[PDB]
Design brief:
Blueprint (H helix, E strand, L loop, with lengths): L3 H11 L18 H10 L9
The structure holds one DNA strand of 49 nucleotides.
Length: 51
DNA sequence: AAAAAAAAAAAAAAAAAAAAAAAAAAAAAAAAAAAAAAAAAAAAAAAAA
């Protein structure tokens, strides 16, 4: 449920760190499930409890 | 000479079998539906006119 602009904001906040968004056989960003968790953990979306 | 008694006979009654008829069951189809499998059109990502 993250709009494209929100997801680009999240990856602009995240990617400059040491993390690399692992790509599959192609360049397509193959964000692992844990990668997605971390991304939206620090993306700024409050959890169902922390909100 | 005639009567009665005795003996060798047809007709009716009872039981079983073979013809046929109807219904039900096994089967043996030609047709359809559902599920499965083998390709395809908008969106997304990175390096470069």
């Amino acid at each position: 449920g993250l709009t494209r602009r929100k997801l680009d904001e999240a990856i602009a906040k995240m990617e400059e760190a040491g993390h690399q968004f692992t790509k599959n056989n192609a360049n397509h960003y193959s964000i692992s499930l844990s990668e997605a968790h971390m991304l939206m953990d620090a993306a700024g979306v409050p959890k169902f409890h922390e909100r």
